[PDB]
């Protein structure tokens, strides 16, 4: 029930909502989570994605190519899609596998890559990215940061 996020994971989800609204959509799917991860800018996910050349403008262009622009209709409820909810479940699994009870930005990214199917996955493929390498680089960075 969404009680297991850190502040920075909530910040990524807020940015995913804003990315939905920017294109006139009123849902958060895997692809909006991807855009929020890239654009958040400060967390582990953002700093891995940037290192790997995954650029927000490029990702936005690919997202729009696949889903287009919506009605611009805004509703206060902005629910997650089923695949996004699956990503959130997988993100909690990844957090616990890494010794955390709460989901941070890296866990959202790891969960996104594990779901592996859906608009975000297609965007990453279209950008030339390799999800297995992204995973490896996330876990590398988490380990490097252990003394803090």
Residue numbers in the entry: 94 to 241
Task: Quote the study that presented this structure, word for word.
The 1.20 Å structure showed AtClpC1 N-terminal domain (residues 94–238) to be a α-helical domain, having 66% helical content and made up of eight tightly packed α-helices: α1 (E100-L116), α2 (T123-E133), α3 (I137-M145), α4 (L149-I160), α5 (P175-L191), α6 (S198-E208), α7 (V212-L220) and α8 (P224-N238). The two central helices: α2 and α6 which are rich in the hydrophobic residues Leu and Ile contribute significantly to the packing. The fold of AtClpC1 NTD contains two repeats of a 4-helix motif that share 46% sequence identity and 84.1% similarity in a region of 63-residue overlap. A 14-residue long loop between α4 and α5 connects the two repeats. The two halves that stay in close proximity are related by a pseudo two-fold axis of symmetry. Strong sequence identity and conservation of secondary structure between the two halves suggest the possibility of an early evolutionary gene duplication event that could have resulted in this repeated motif, as has been predicted for the N-terminal domain of bacterial ClpA and other ClpC proteins. A query to the DALI database and PDBeFold server with AtClpC1 NTD structure coordinates yielded NTD of mycobacterial ClpC1 and other Gram-positive bacterial ClpC as the most similar structures. A comparison of the crystal structures of MtClpC1-CymA complex and AtClpC1 shows the CymA-interacting residues to be conserved. Phe95, Phe173, Lys178 and Glu182 of AtClpC1 occupy the same position as the residues involved in MtClpC1 NTD interaction with CymA. So we presume CymA would bind readily to AtClpC1 NTD as well.
